[PDB]
Design a binder for these strands. Structure first.
Ligand SMILES: [Mg+2]
Ligand SMILES: [Mg+2]
Ligand SMILES: [Mg+2]
Ligand SMILES: [Mg+2]
Ligand SMILES: [Mg+2]
Ligand SMILES: [Mg+2]
Ligand SMILES: [Mg+2]
Ligand SMILES: [Mg+2]
Ligand SMILES: [Mg+2]
Ligand SMILES: [Mg+2]
Ligand SMILES: [Mg+2]
Ligand SMILES: [Mg+2]
Ligand SMILES: [Mg+2]
Ligand SMILES: [Mg+2]
Ligand SMILES: [Mg+2]
Ligand SMILES: [Mg+2]
Ligand SMILES: [Mg+2]
Ligand SMILES: [Mg+2]
Ligand SMILES: [Mg+2]
Ligand SMILES: [Mg+2]
Ligand SMILES: [Mg+2]
Ligand SMILES: [Mg+2]
Ligand SMILES: [Mg+2]
Ligand SMILES: [Mg+2]
Ligand SMILES: [Mg+2]
Ligand SMILES: [Mg+2]
Ligand SMILES: [Mg+2]
Ligand SMILES: [Mg+2]
Ligand SMILES: [Mg+2]
Ligand SMILES: [Mg+2]
Ligand SMILES: [Mg+2]
Ligand SMILES: [Mg+2]
Ligand SMILES: [Mg+2]
Ligand SMILES: [Mg+2]
Ligand SMILES: [Mg+2]
Ligand SMILES: [Mg+2]
Ligand SMILES: [Mg+2]
Ligand SMILES: [Mg+2]
Ligand SMILES: [Mg+2]
Ligand SMILES: [Mg+2]
Ligand SMILES: [Mg+2]
Ligand SMILES: [Mg+2]
Ligand SMILES: [Mg+2]
Ligand SMILES: [Mg+2]
Ligand SMILES: [Mg+2]
Ligand SMILES: [Mg+2]
Ligand SMILES: [Mg+2]
Ligand SMILES: [Mg+2]
Ligand SMILES: [Mg+2]
Lengths: 138, 101, 117, 59, 154, 113
RNA sequence: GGUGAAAAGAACCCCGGGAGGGGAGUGAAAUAGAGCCUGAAACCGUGGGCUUACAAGCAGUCACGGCCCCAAGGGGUUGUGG
RNA sequence: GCGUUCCCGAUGCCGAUGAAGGCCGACCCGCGAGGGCGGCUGGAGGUAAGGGAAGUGCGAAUGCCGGCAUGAGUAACGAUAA
């Protein structure tokens, strides 16, 4: 008989930004990071993983054209309208989300993935006025 | 010291003195000694070398104060008008006492 | 001779009830709401003991992989590096080395890529 | 016995759950002058009474 | 069902009451109702093959004798039906009352003698039967008796 | 220590009095008195009386001394209900249940340091 | 339909208009006190333990982790995850 | 194969040093139906081996009888002559 359990770790954050990347192609890696999928002391039920921080938001490439080609229905008020929003908008009118959303649909659906999304901390920087230990990853 | 022996199609890593279930063995009596194969020395100041099935002769010395144990269970298959609660599996356990490496 | 139901039943039920103690509502207060439950509970356990097995199969791979990925290699490559090398060992499970005594693992990795020189 | 009707016995849960707001509220009484007894605020209780106003009987 | 003492009226209109459909309160699913397959007074006898009825008494006497518990008596000092006298007899007769004794004799006086001993089954000779034989641990009978039993098959 | 009361077969629905009762669960005998004294319900007059007697007992019978006692605990149980027929429209007729209650109250001594 | 072997069926005091109770007392027994043996289940309560107010469910099952009564184990509960 | 009632075994054997039934238990024994053990309750019956007999096993028949729930502290409280 065996067992393989980890005690109370210590959230080892990460500061990051590759605005030269394609969100998604990036987001994944971020998500992968979020939940401790890289750190070999796994426990899908625990909630241990990097406290990922992304700076210098946007500036993100995005392959082919999403000049209103990428729509964000996401919003369905309730009476008769399902308000749609193209990329351009979010970029101009407060971006960040752009990447945020990309991360949500990569993190699991439970109160955990919900909790994990609480880790991610993206800003439209550069500048992450919120850290005491940014371990910028490459 | 470390070590990884295989028994009952299953392989465990043992130390210098301990054990649990392992599965019925013709080691008929309780106070008896048996030696199961080994798979990775243990890295300690004594070694740390594995290899192809590590059949390097060396093995683990195991005694064992056992007696075919069992355990609750209850296996109730059930379809539909088909019920078969007709199952109690306790599974025979075989307690061992790992000695030396 | 008239054989009354007498006791029989009551007992026949107390049994099933005990079995279903701690359940939700009538689910654990009804000689039958209980039954119906204990049924699901039936396969559930059974079907799961089958899952649990292959549950850890996966539960480990992650470790292995998310462990030997630190030494620049795929769990995919890794494994193969062993099969074609020789190692009816490690037992996706016993790759618990990747955690406890990671140096034991190290040699393995290097051992791995070896077979693929 | 007619048109709209309960579609399910209400669970002992949601039953009590519905009563959460049933708890009674203690009345509000106060010292009261003369007698060290109790009376509710802004009230003339039949014992000592009031001043300039009648009540029961005293001396 | 019909054996019961209720009316035959049809308790309910049968079609627009929601209530289950029903006959008379005599219906066996009505508590008060009549039993379905209850027991009816019936006989249980049958005619066991004579040639067997006897070959059976044979194995009876037999067994008991093979175990040496068979005893053909003759000397009976017991008179005017007296428990004492009988008990006395058996004593020196080799029957202290340890094993059950099937006593069979054409002597009603002896009959009375043990007619009351808890460890004895007194039975006229013509009444011999595998049950009682088997029922008791020791068979003891008058010579006369053993003859008739023999006459019953030589 | 503790003084009991219990007044069975009162004739008022349990649910109904349980209310006045929870209103005094664990309190100074001195206070509860006032409370019930001005609690507008019918249970009052019932739980009143009882609680008042638990007091009596407490003293007269268990020498506990009024001043130091309160409401250790109290509660109410269903009694055997009286079924009654209620003529319903179109000759339906229903059975109304005049429920009944068992009010128990147990005093106790507060402290002594 | 069934108090108890026997009415010995609850004097007297206390609360209360009564009913009911609390002591006292009878009895082997009063959770044998009177539609009173035994008294199951549904159902209504009081007290205690674990547990819940960002989360979506045939109500369970598998797995780890935490809290509460005995200790290379077990029970009870259940926070996530499957 | 397991249980229920009954008869033979019984002028027997258990039984107030507590039967039957009930309420608990993480014990033991059976693949299972069940069978034992132990602890509280109960207070007078029970019934081995091995056999024989049946009114012999319930979750559903808008089943039947009884009890208790839900709706619900909701509608109502029976002429608006006060
Ligand atoms: Mg926007
Ligand atoms: Mg076994
Ligand atoms: Mg079955
Ligand atoms: Mg039946
Ligand atoms: Mg299913
Ligand atoms: Mg595998
Ligand atoms: Mg409740
Ligand atoms: Mg007729
Ligand atoms: Mg008639
Ligand atoms: Mg007709
Ligand atoms: Mg209908
Ligand atoms: Mg009748
Ligand atoms: Mg009849
Ligand atoms: Mg003839
Ligand atoms: Mg006789
Ligand atoms: Mg005879
Ligand atoms: Mg007073
Ligand atoms: Mg009306
Ligand atoms: Mg009319
Ligand atoms: Mg009596
Ligand atoms: Mg009694
Ligand atoms: Mg009673
Ligand atoms: Mg009696
Ligand atoms: Mg009870
Ligand atoms: Mg509580
Ligand atoms: Mg939450
Ligand atoms: Mg929200
Ligand atoms: Mg919360
Ligand atoms: Mg929830
Ligand atoms: Mg569901
Ligand atoms: Mg669980
Ligand atoms: Mg779950
Ligand atoms: Mg009978
Ligand atoms: Mg006789
Ligand atoms: Mg005896
Ligand atoms: Mg019986
Ligand atoms: Mg108990
Ligand atoms: Mg017992
Ligand atoms: Mg008993
Ligand atoms: Mg038998
Ligand atoms: Mg039989
Ligand atoms: Mg029948
Ligand atoms: Mg049925
Ligand atoms: Mg209907
Ligand atoms: Mg009914
Ligand atoms: Mg109703
Ligand atoms: Mg309503
Ligand atoms: Mg309303
Ligand atoms: Mg109204």
């Amino acid at each position: 008989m065996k067992t393989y359990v980890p005690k109370q770790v210590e959230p080892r954050w990460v500061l990051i930004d590759a605005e030269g990347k394609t969100l998604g192609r990036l987001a994944t890696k971020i998500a992968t990071l979020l939940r401790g999928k890289h750190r070999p002391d796994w426990t899908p039920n625990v909630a241990m993983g990097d406290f990922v921080v992304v700076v210098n938001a946007d500036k993100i490439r995005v392959t082919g054209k999403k000049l209103e080609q990428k729509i964000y229905t996401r919003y369905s008020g309730y009476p008769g309208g399902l308000k749609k929003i193209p990329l351009e908008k979010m970029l101009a009118t407060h971006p960040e989300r752009v990447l945020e959303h990309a991360v949500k649909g990569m993190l699991p659906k439970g109160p955990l993935g919900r909790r994990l999304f609480k880790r991610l901390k993206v800003y439209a920087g550069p500048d992450h006025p919120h850290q005491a230990q940014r371990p910028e990853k490459l | 010291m470390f070590a990884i022996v295989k028994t009952g199609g299953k392989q465990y890593r043992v130390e210098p003195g301990l054990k649990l279930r392992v599965e019925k063995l013709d080691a008929e009596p309780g106070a008896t000694v048996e030696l199961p194969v080994l798979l990775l020395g243990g890295e300690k100041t004594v070694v740390g070398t594995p290899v192809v099935e590590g059949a390097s002769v060396v093995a683990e010395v195991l005694g064992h104060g056992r007696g075919k144990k069992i355990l609750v269970s209850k296996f109730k298959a059930k379809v539909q008008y088909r019920r078969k609660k007709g199952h109690r599996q306790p599974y025979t356990e075989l307690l061992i006492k790992e000695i030396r490496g | 001779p008239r054989a009354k139901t007498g006791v029989v039943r009551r007992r026949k039920h107390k049994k099933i009830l005990k079995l279903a103690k701690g359940y939700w509502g009538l689910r654990s207060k009804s000689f039958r709401k209980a039954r119906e439950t204990l049924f699901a509970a039936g396969n559930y356990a059974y079907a799961h003991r089958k899952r649990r097995k292959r549950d850890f199969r996966r539960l480990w791979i992650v470790r292995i992989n998310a462990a030997c990925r630190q030494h620049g290699l795929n769990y995919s490559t890794f494994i193969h590096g062993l099969k074609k090398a020789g190692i009816e060992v490690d037992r996706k499970n016993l790759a618990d080395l990747a955690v406890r005594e990671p140096q034991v693992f190290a040699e393995l990795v290097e051992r791995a890529k070896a077979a693929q020189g | 016995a007619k048109h709209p009707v309960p579609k399910k016995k209400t669970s002992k849960a949601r039953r009590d759950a519905r009563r959460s707001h049933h708890a009674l509220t203690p009345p509000t009484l106060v010292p009261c002058p003369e007698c060290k007894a109790m009376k509710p605020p802004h009230t003339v209780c039949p014992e000592c009474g009031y001043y300039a106003g009648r009540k029961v009987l005293e001396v | 069902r019909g054996e019961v003492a209720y009316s035959g009226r049809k308790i309910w209109p049968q079609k627009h009451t929601g209530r289950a459909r029903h006959g008379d309160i005599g219906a066996p699913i009505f508590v008060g109702g009549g039993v379905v397959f209850g027991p009816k007074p019936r006989d249980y006898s049958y005619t066991l093959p004579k040639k067997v009825r006897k070959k059976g008494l044979a194995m009876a006497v037999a067994d008991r004798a093979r175990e040496g518990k068979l005893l053909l008596v003759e000397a009976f000092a017991g008179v005017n039906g007296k428990t004492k006298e009988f008990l006395a007899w058996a004593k020196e007769a080799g029957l202290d009352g340890s094993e059950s004794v099937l006593l069979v004799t054409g002597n009603e006086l002896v009959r009375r003698a043990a007619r009351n001993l808890p460890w004895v089954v007194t039975l006229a000779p013509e009444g011999l039967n595998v049950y009682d034989i088997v029922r008791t641990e020791r068979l003891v009978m008058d010579l006369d008796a053993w003859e008739v039993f023999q006459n019953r098959i030589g | 220590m503790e003084a009991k009361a219990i007044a069975r077969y009162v004739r008022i629905s349990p649910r109904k009095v349980r209310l006045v009762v929870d209103l005094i669960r664990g309190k100074s005998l001195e206070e509860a008195r006032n409370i019930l004294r001005y609690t507008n319900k019918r249970g009052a007059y019932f739980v009143a009386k009882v609680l008042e007697s638990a007091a009596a007992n407490a003293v007269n019978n268990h020498d506990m001394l009024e001043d130091r006692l309160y409401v250790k605990a109290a509660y109410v149980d269903e009694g055997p209900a009286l079924k009654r027929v209620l003529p319903r429209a179109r000759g339906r007729a229903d059975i109304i249940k005049k429920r009944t209650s068992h009010i128990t109250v147990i005093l106790g001594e507060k402290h002594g340091k």
